[PDB]
Amino acid sequence: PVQQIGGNYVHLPLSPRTLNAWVKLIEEKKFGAEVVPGFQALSEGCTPYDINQMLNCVGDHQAAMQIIRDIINEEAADWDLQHPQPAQQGQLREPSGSDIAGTTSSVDEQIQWMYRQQNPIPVGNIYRRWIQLGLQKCVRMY
């Protein structure tokens, strides 16, 4: 997530312990249900970068990544259209679907987007609850 240093916002990364307590939620509960909110709780206030950091920690128990990516693109699609860029220079770009998901953006951008004065956009808590929707998918598969 992010910490404010004198009116300025700086990425504070996820403490190791804060990933552990999460990797453990799977391997000890292995999806199911207790993870949908479990994740949501850890997910609180993160950037797209952070969310990603979490997932890579469990690309071994990976039989579920494929369907989550499915919804991300499904919604990224819904996004690259409804709110398009639609275009520049100097000013930071408008966040596409690949941006919001953290795959074509830096964390600086993601913060630059979450906390801009003129029209701030919560990429964290947007992409965040794509992950939420893609997870119920997983859940039912049980």
Author numbering: 1 to 87, 89 to 143
Text lifted from the article:
TRIM5α is an intrinsic immunity protein that blocks retrovirus infection through a specific interaction with the viral capsid. In the case of lentiviruses, the cone-shaped capsid is composed of 12 pentamers and approximately 200 hexamers, each in turn comprised of identical copies of monomeric capsid (CA) protein. The N-terminal domain makes up the outer surface of the capsid and mediates interactions with cellular cofactors. All reported retroviral N-terminal domain structures contain a conserved five α-helix core, from which a conserved surface feature, the β-hairpin, protrudes into the cytoplasm.
To provide a relevant structural context for evaluating the mutagenesis results, we determined the structure of the SIVmac239 CA N-terminal domain. In particular, the five α-helices of the SIVmac239 N-terminal domain core did not deviate from those of HIV-1 or HIV-2, consistent with the observation that the SIV-HIVinterior chimera remained largely resistant to restriction. We compared the SIVmac239 CA N-terminal domain structure to all of the previously reported wild type HIV-1 and HIV-2 CA N-terminal domain structures in which the surface features were properly folded. Specifically, the 4–5 loops and β-hairpins formed two clusters; one composed of HIV-1 structures, and the other composed of SIVmac239 and HIV-2 structures. Measurements between the HIV-1 Cα of Gly94 or Gln95 and the corresponding Gly91 and Gln92 of SIVmac239 indicate that these two groups are separated by 3.3–11 Å in the structural alignment. Similarly, measurements between the Cα of HIV-1 Gly8 and the homologous SIVmac239/HIV-2 Gly7 show the two groups are separated by 4–8.5 Å in the structural alignment. The SIVmac239 4–5 loop, like that of HIV-2, is positioned further over the conserved surface patch than that of most HIV-1 loops. Structurally, the surface patch was conserved across SIVmac239, HIV-1 and HIV-2. The C-terminus or the 4–5 loop, helix 5 and helix 6 were in very close agreement with the structures of HIV-1 and HIV-2, indicative of strong selection to preserve the overall architecture and amino acid composition of this site.
